[PDB]
With several copies, the nearest count.
Chain A
Amino acid sequence: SSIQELYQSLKEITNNALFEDRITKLDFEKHANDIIKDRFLRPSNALPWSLLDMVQDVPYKELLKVPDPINRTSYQFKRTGLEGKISGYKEEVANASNSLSITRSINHNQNSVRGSTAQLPFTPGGILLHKDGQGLFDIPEGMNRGIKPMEWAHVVDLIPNPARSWPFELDTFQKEAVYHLEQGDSVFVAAHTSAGKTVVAEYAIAMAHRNMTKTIYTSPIKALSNQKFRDFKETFDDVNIGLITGDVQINPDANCLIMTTEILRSMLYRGADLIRDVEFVIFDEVHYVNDGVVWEEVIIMLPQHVKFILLSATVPNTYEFANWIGRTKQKNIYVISTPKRPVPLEINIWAKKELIPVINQNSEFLEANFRKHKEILNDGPSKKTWPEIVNYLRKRELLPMVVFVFSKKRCEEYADWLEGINFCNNKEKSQIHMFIEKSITRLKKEDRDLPQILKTRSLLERGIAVHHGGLLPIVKELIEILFSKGFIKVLFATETFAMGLNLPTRTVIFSSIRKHDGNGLRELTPGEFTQMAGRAGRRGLDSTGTVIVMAYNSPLSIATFKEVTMGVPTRLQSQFRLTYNMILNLLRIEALRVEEMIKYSFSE
């Protein structure tokens, strides 16, 4: 019975009027000679390799590459009359590995986003062997034998068809930046955080989209890239944005691309075709200083058709860097500075269950109140101090509040001392539970059951959370999104949370004014305090921003308090460095010698 008979027998199975796991009636278990004959004594037509081993025996002009032809003639179009239209044509008289020109041929086999070391970069913007014997060359170059046969920066004091419009009236510095971008050159804006520096970036992106070009948005921190991607996804219509990471590429052919500075530098050193159409590169958090911050190398290595928009905090060294960039790249750059903050900030001191203001709205110190503090008191938090402050702020309606603690363990320890305090209703708890459940559906049951997730979920459903660098990135993203939604009332955070992020808060509390970094405890610099304390007021929903510095059974020194709270702000510093990879790449390229790159730098 062949397969046809068996398949014909199958069709007799008639459907009748739940699934049942059935068991076959077939029995799988002297013709044993047929197997032996087929296995041990069957000659075959196909000779095995053993016999082929016995009967089989094994039996410069064409290795060269002839150069390809050359064409030097082309076509040119000559328009005629007003409103120029093509009237006539006339017959008139370089790869990635040969030329540094922007006009070299594009090879479609390689990646247009990342590139390769087989491609030379593009030209950065703004920057004997004859051993003849009897008449003929004999010694090649690099060997000892032949063949033996055998332009300024400007400071500004504070459009008919705008590319983007906003409901509210723009600030003076925003209008100045927009006008200078429209005129067709660079700007360098230094303003307080959350003062509206994103308007400039949005207008630059809209301008680039109007002109059929592209924009690159870079930041030195990879955590900010996802937040900026979501923000620009929500803000922008009719323009598509993408995200470039070390491995993942989202919308590579997008008008706006968000990446880090090191990714852009790696792209630049390998001659990626992406930079051909890029019009703007935006440098955010320029003031950031950590001992990935390679933006100066990017400035040096950029092509000459790219303009710059640099966003930074208030620093007193702006003109030096602006002048350096303008002189190096022969670009006109404008410096816009603004010290205005939309919500005034008041400095308080917490001592003996009393809030004592010491710096009023106009940044005036109060000596009498500091003396009152010092005499009233006459060291760290105890297990009964956080609930007192929390209840005090709930009574006066000063929530949400953020407490900055500079150690991973103490944040979680402090959060556990708030047991017995609840800030959520039934509907709020249900919504938080729903959001947490929907966020972790991409993980496995083993991943969903990690102790950190359970602990955070226990904390989140009461309006309390903890933010530090020892958490999983998904947990941190969940906490940030829930805080942005307005569900969290009390939060303990490290310096991770004090960088550019969405932070609607009404009160800021400092556990301490000393931070242990590197090797040794160190009192907070005025820049760190200014950035951290400058996030205490919501524009349009809060009248004032309350800042509380806590003293525990011991008066605070007036010298350190004055040095940290009101002192000379930090300056910009150059983080340019020399690396063996840098030198080796420059030597291999054989253009832009290292001495020239060094002499074109802020340090030199």
Chain B
Amino acid sequence: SKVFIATANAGKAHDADIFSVSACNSFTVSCSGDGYLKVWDNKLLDNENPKDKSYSHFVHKSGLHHVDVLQAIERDAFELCLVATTSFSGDLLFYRITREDETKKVIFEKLDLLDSDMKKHSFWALKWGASNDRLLSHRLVATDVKGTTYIWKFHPFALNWSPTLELQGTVESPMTPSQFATSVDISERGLIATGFNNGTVQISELSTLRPLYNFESQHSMINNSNSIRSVKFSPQGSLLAIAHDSNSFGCITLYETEFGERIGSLSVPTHLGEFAHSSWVMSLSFNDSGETLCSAGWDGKLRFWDVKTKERITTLNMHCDDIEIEEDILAVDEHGDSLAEPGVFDVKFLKKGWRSGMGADLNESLCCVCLDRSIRWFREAGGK
């Protein structure tokens, strides 16, 4: 991944901050603080505004900050697409996405999968675990404000549609008193990683739900900075990338999950020390092959790293004037503050063939949401 070309964008897509983004083969999902959920069609034609092929639905008045989509072919012909979101109030909501036969419009259907006793908790993070030959049932993992990780199993059928969520168990925080669980991830090999606000990461086994490792990524414990913002597993390898703060700096550390030992860190010279970004790292993403890592920075840059050599490859700069339609450009916010270099909230790699359009048919894509309330799409030059 060396050359990235912008293919489409949509400024002023949402009315508030777009905190997360997710993609599937059919569409891309965005959640914002205004309480809406927008579905963007991935199969665009030449000379088509992205906002023309978009559909929105209102979920919660308090806004949404996490989103994940699960798409799979559950039977010979049955197809299910599920969207899970969590709100600022702490509610976990599930929606089924389907399309009309004639108009081809997207329909939203709300699902009820949590019992009354399960609705008393405040969830923060979530992640869909799809079937990857590890076990025949899909998985859902979430964290709460008390530090506990929950694991479920989703059963679509009881072909008869009757979804049901079955709780497998819970994993508690490794330290007393409990801390805030800020991020969570699940791998294809059956591992769960959880990040905490004190800088501690815990890894537990999916099958038996018992802790394995407890490594501490803090540079120094002089101050109470250095919380964990993002934890990501490598798609095929035994590698775990950690994004953590360092007293106004952003750091990335690499660990190997077979034995849990520190491998190294990614850093570049910035206006000394070992820091990857100037402000903070808010998101991380691996490509399909697991050889390139993308970090979204609060400073307004997308940096691409070589995993094996731990060296930077290229940098993408974000500007408010990159929006095609000039009437959608948001130069200043509601307080007159500049947005010429807006920070990135989330970044996502799209698989080959997911996103079609201006030459993006045979190579990997990329999507990001920024502070100017915009959503942007890129494509990798060349083919594969």
Q: Which chain A residue shows the least CB distance to B145?
A: A7
Given contact pairs A438-B358, A446-B321, A19 touches B35 in the complex (Cβ within 8 A): yes
Q: Which chain B residue shows the least CB distance to A447?
A: B321
Given contact pairs A11-B122, A19-B16, A240 touches B91 in the complex (Cβ within 8 A): no
Are A15's CB and B6's CB within 8 A?
A: no
Give a binary string over A237-249; 1 marks a CB under 8 Å from any B CB, 0 the rest: 0001011000111
Are B15's CB and A19's CB within 8 A?
A: yes
Chain A residues with CB under 8 A of B6: 441-442
Chain B residues with CB under 8 A of A248: 2-3
Q: Does B62 contact A (CB under 8 A)?
A: yes
Are A10's CB and B88's CB within 8 A?
A: yes
Interface centre among A15, A233, A243, A247 (most CB of B within 10 A): A15
Contact of A7 among B122, B319, B382 (CB under 8 A): B122
Give a binary string over B9-52; 1 marks a CB under 8 Å from any A CB, 0 the rest: 00000011000000000000000001110000000001100000
Q: Does A421 contact B (CB under 8 A)?
A: no
Chain A residues with CB under 8 A of B36: 19
Are B89's CB and A250's CB within 8 A?
A: no
Q: Does B334 contact A (CB under 8 A)?
A: yes
Distance in Å: Cβ of B338 to nearest Cβ of chain A: 15
Are A13's CB and B326's CB within 8 A?
A: no
Q: Which chain A residue shows the least CB distance to B89?
A: A10
Distance in Å: Cβ of A485 to nearest Cβ of chain B: 15
Q: Does A58 contact B (CB under 8 A)?
A: no
Are B2's CB and A21's CB within 8 A?
A: no
Distance in Å: Cβ of B371 to nearest Cβ of chain A: 16
Are A16's CB and B319's CB within 8 A?
A: no
Are A15's CB and B61's CB within 8 A?
A: yes
Are B319's CB and A250's CB within 8 A?
A: no
Are A11's CB and B90's CB within 8 A?
A: yes
Give a binary string over B230-254; 1 marks a CB under 8 Å from any A CB, 0 the rest: 0000000000000000000000000
Chain A residues with CB under 8 A of B61: 13, 15-16
Chain B residues with CB under 8 A of A250: 2-3, 381-382
Contact of A4 among B146, B309, B323 (CB under 8 A): B146
Chain B residues with CB under 8 A of A109: 309
Chain B interface, number of residues (Cβ within 8 angstroms): 38
Q: Does A26 contact B (CB under 8 A)?
A: no
Contact of A444 among B7, B180, B321 (CB under 8 A): B321
Chain A interface, number of residues (Cβ within 8 angstroms): 28
Chain B residues with CB under 8 A of A446: 321
Interface centre among A10, A16, A109 (most CB of B within 10 A): A10
**Which residues of A in the span 1-40 have a Cβ within 8 Å of any Cβ on B?**
3-4, 7-8, 10-11, 13, 15-16, 19, 21
Q: Which chain B residue shows the least CB distance to A440?
A: B324
Q: Does A434 contact B (CB under 8 A)?
A: yes
Chain B residues with CB under 8 A of A19: 15-16, 34-36
Contact of B334 among A10, A13, A21, A444 (CB under 8 A): A21
Q: Does B329 contact A (CB under 8 A)?
A: yes
Chain B residues with CB under 8 A of A3: 145, 180
Are B329's CB and A445's CB within 8 A?
A: yes
Interface centre among B46, B321, B384 (most CB of A within 10 A): B321
Are A445's CB and B326's CB within 8 A?
A: yes
Q: Does B153 contact A (CB under 8 A)?
A: no
Are A11's CB and B3's CB within 8 A?
A: no
Q: Which chain B residue shows the least CB distance to A10?
A: B89
Are B145's CB and A4's CB within 8 A?
A: yes
Chain B residues with CB under 8 A of A10: 62, 88-90, 122
Q: Does A251 contact B (CB under 8 A)?
A: yes
Chain B residues with CB under 8 A of A249: 2
Given contact pairs A4-B146, A15-B61, A434 touches B2 in the complex (Cβ within 8 A): no
Are A11's CB and B91's CB within 8 A?
A: yes
Given contact pairs A7-B145, A10-B88, A19-B35, A444 touches B322 in the complex (Cβ within 8 A): yes
Q: Which chain A residue shows the least CB distance to B381?
A: A250
Distance in Å: Cβ of B6 to nearest Cβ of chain A: 5
Chain A residues with CB under 8 A of B273: none
Chain A residues with CB under 8 A of B319: 444
Give a binary string over B67-108; 1 marks a CB under 8 Å from any A CB, 0 the rest: 000000000000000000000111100000000000000000
Chain A residues with CB under 8 A of B351: none
Interface centre among B91, B180, B382 (most CB of A within 10 A): B382
Chain A residues with CB under 8 A of B329: 445
Q: Does B5 contact A (CB under 8 A)?
A: yes
Chain B residues with CB under 8 A of A441: 6-7, 324, 358
Q: Does B60 contact A (CB under 8 A)?
A: yes
Q: Does B383 contact A (CB under 8 A)?
A: yes
Chain A residues with CB under 8 A of B89: 10-11, 13
Chain A residues with CB under 8 A of B326: 445
**Which residues of B in the span 200-252 have a Cβ within 8 Å of any Cβ on A?**
none
Q: Which chain B residue shows the least CB distance to A110?
A: B309
**Which residues of B in the span 136-150 have a Cβ within 8 Å of any Cβ on A?**
145-146
Chain A residues with CB under 8 A of B88: 10
Are A8's CB and B122's CB within 8 A?
A: yes
Contact of B383 among A16, A251, A434 (CB under 8 A): A251
Given contact pairs A10-B62, A240-B383, A445 touches B321 in the complex (Cβ within 8 A): yes
Chain A residues with CB under 8 A of B321: 444-446
Chain A residues with CB under 8 A of B15: 19
Interface centre among B36, B61, B88 (most CB of A within 10 A): B61
Distance in Å: Cβ of B281 to nearest Cβ of chain A: 24
Chain B residues with CB under 8 A of A233: 383
Chain B residues with CB under 8 A of A240: 383-384
Distance in Å: Cβ of B178 to nearest Cβ of chain A: 10
Chain A residues with CB under 8 A of B7: 441
Are B5's CB and A442's CB within 8 A?
A: yes
Chain A residues with CB under 8 A of B122: 7-8, 10-11
Distance in Å: Cβ of A118 to nearest Cβ of chain B: 15
Chain A residues with CB under 8 A of B324: 441
Chain B residues with CB under 8 A of A444: 319, 321-322
Closest 10 CB pairs of A and B: A19-B34, A445-B321, A250-B382, A7-B122, A10-B89, A19-B15, A444-B321, A13-B89, A248-B2, A442-B6
> What are 14 A-B residue pairs whose CB atoms fall within 8 Å in the complex?
A4-B145, A10-B88, A10-B122, A11-B90, A11-B120, A13-B89, A19-B34, A240-B383, A240-B384, A247-B2, A250-B2, A441-B6, A445-B326, A446-B321
6 new A-B pairs (CB below 8 Å) besides A11-B91, A13-B62, A438-B46?
A7-B145, A19-B15, A21-B334, A243-B382, A247-B2, A445-B321
Residues of A within 8 A of B (CB): 3-4, 7-8, 10-11, 13, 15-16, 19, 21, 109, 233, 240, 242-243, 247-251, 434, 438, 441-442, 444-446
